């Protein structure tokens, strides 16, 4: 139980660090979607704009990769 509480407090550090690193803003999403096209990115850059759009609309906020894809 000594190492059990060490591990449990490891989990508490990661659980505070995820909300310290919290980027769970759903307010920007549709505006970012519509400004993908009309702010006309280059071919490589529009390609990654479509890529980072493709990372969303299945996974959005309960996961680090979707939130950082939304941040990117």
């Amino acid at each position: 139980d000594t190492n059990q509480r060490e591990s449990y407090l490891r989990e508490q550090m990661k659980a505070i660090q995820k909300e310290l690193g919290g980027e769970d803003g759903l307010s920007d999403l549709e505006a970012l979607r519509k400004k993908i096209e009309e702010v006309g990115m280059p071919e490589a850059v529009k390609t990654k704009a479509l890529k980072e759009l493709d990372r969303l609309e299945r996974m959005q906020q309960g996961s680090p990769e979707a939130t950082v894809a939304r941040t990117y």
Binding site: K18, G21, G22, E23, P64, E65, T67, V68, T71, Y72
Partner: peptide, 13 residues
């Protein structure tokens, strides 16, 4: 990490 970005394997990149 601040000239380029941060690695795409966590939130906080």
């Amino acid at each position: 990490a601040e000239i380029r970005g941060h690695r795409r394997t966590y939130i906080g990149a």
